[PDB]
Amino acid sequence: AIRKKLVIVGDGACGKTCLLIVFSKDQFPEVYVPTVFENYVADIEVDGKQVELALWDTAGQEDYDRLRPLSYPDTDVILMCFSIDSPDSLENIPEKWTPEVKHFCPNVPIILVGNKKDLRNDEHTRRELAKMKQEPVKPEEGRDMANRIGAFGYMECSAKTKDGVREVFEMATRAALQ
Amino acid sequence: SMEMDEKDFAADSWSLAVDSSFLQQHKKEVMKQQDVIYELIQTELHHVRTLKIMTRLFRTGMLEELHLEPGVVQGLFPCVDELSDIHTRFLSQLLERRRQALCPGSTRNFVIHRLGDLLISQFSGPSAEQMCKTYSEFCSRHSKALKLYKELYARDKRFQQFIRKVTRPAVLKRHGVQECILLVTQRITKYPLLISRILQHSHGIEEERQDLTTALGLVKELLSNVDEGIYQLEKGARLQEIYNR
Ligand SMILES: CNC(=O)c1cccc2cc[nH]c12
Ligand SMILES: CNC(=O)c1cccc2cc[nH]c12
Ligand SMILES: CNC(=O)c1cccc2cc[nH]c12
Numbered sequence: 001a002i003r004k005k006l007v008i009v010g011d012g013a014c015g016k017t018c019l020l021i022v023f024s025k026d027q028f029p030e031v032y033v034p035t036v037f038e039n040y041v042a043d044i045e046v047d048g049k050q051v052e053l054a055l056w057d058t059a060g061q062e063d064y065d066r067l068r069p070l071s072y073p074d075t076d077v078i079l080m081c082f083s084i085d086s087p088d089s090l091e092n093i094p095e096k097w098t099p100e101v102k103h104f105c106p107n108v109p110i111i112l113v114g115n116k117k118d119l120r121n122d123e124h125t126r127r128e129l130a131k132m133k134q135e136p137v138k139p140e141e142g143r144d145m146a147n148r149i150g151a152f153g154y155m156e157c158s159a160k161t162k163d164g165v166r167e168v169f170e171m172a173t174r175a176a177l178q
Numbered sequence: 179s180m181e182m183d184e185k186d187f188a189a190d191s192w193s194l195a196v197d198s199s200f201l202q203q204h205k206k207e208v209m210k211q212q213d214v215i216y217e218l219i220q221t222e223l224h225h226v227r228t229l230k231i232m233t234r235l236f237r238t239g240m241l242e243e244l245h246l247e248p249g250v251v252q253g254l255f256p257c258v259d260e261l262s263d264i265h266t267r268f269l270s271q272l273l274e275r276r277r278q279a280l281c282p283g284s285t286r287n288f289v290i291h292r293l294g295d296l297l298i299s300q301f302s303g304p305s306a307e308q309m310c311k312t313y314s315e316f317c318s319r320h321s322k323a324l325k326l327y328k329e330l331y332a333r334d335k336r337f338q339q340f341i342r343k344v345t346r347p348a349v350l351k352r353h354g355v356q357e358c359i360l361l362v363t364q365r366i367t368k369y370p371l372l373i374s375r376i377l378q379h380s381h382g383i384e385e386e387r388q389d390l391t392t393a394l395g396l397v398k399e400l401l402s403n404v405d406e407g408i409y410q411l412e413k414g415a416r417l418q419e420i421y422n423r
Binding site for chain 2: 029031032034035036038039040041054056057059060061063064065066067070071073074
């Protein structure tokens with residue numbers, strides 16, 4: 001097996017920690033959802049190729065501009081996350097997260113991931129967002145942002161139901177192998 | 179880690195660690211508070227373990243088996259003895275607070291009601307100054323350590339055999355040299371996340387809510403000072419590239 005490294009980036013409320021936890025355990029924890037994620041090395045076989053994929057979170061490093069880049073050396077694939085229940089997290093993608101990743105990870109494929117897709121048809125979410133003249137992120141809005149920033153691709157998932165989670169990490173592995 | 183502490187922190191949560199008859203005696207809010215305190219101690223036990231792999235398995239093994247040029251092992255593992263001293267002491271304090279809280283006749287049933295004071299002590303005074311000085315040095319030497327590792331692995335056959343040998347066991351799967359260095363650098367930014375969630379469930383006692391609020395403030399001040407004190411060292415960097423930073 002070949003070793004590859006994945007780093008997930010995005011705002012504090014984007015769901016990146018939950019996404020790594022659910023994938024690494026293959027389950028949404030029923031008793032306790034951990035606050036933090038240390039690291040993990042997933043055994044993944046995609047399109048006949050065996051890879052050891054090391055997983056890293058940047059949660060907690062958002063306000064520390066000199067500590068945060070230390071997570072980037074030798075990254076093979078970036079997952080750039082936003083939350084579908086937060087159009088504000090999508091807005092910070094092109095002029096905050098994107099130039100940073102392009103500087104420290106030149107030529108590394110970026111996959112733009114819309115997390116919490118289960119909240120797109122949640123009445124409580126739609127009511128809270130309507131108070132700030134907002135609505136859940138539309139699938140075309142996610143695709144257009146991914147197109148704009150030069151992302152390798154656009155994907156959606158729900159850590160809560162696990163839908164789309166395996167497909168995100170299998171595609172990230174394929175991107176890391178190119 | 180030692181077997182006694184590994185077994186005490188084997189369960190996925192505090193609610194699964196204690197006996198069910200003991201869990202049933204507490205309110206939901208106390209269980210939520212204890213689950214996060216348990217996660218803080220469990221991750222501190224693993225962080226000390228990462229430091230022992232670095233000092234004992236890698237560093238000492240290279241000194242005792244390989245013929246590396248002087249100053250090469252220090253370059254691969256900067257400040258590891260100092261970091262091990264800070265965290266082993268902090269872990270000792272957390273584990274003694276848990277031990278004093280155990281019910282008589284039990285080695286697993288406890289409730290920690292007063293964490294805030296311990297966190298204020300760790301993140302203030304000389305221990306905070308030592309943590310700030312050590313992480314500012316470690317994090318400024320992080321990129322150099324990774325590049326030195328990659329150079330040695332690519333060009334030294336005996337170094338490559340040593341690494342492949344000691345990292346072959348499945349219990350070392352997440353703990354190769356580069357993975358340990360990033361695990362240590364990332365440890366300090368996990369503290370505010372853990373402290374904020376403990377604070378969310380510690381409103382029942384006003385003195386505890388105030389103590390955790392003070393501790394959260396101190397950890398953030400330490401992180402800001404460390405972040406402002408970092409500048410990556412690079413082997414063979416010329417003075418002109420440094421003063422034109
Ligand atoms: C170009 N030098 C830089 O240091 C840099 C550039 C872009 C984003 C970030 C975030 C931290 N540093 C950054
Ligand atoms: C500043 N650039 C853009 O806004 C952009 C670029 C590429 C595709 C789309 C779709 C919508 N906007 C796009
Ligand atoms: C970091 N501060 C927090 O309050 C927090 C963190 C992670 C999960 C939950 C669930 C409730 N609060 C949480």
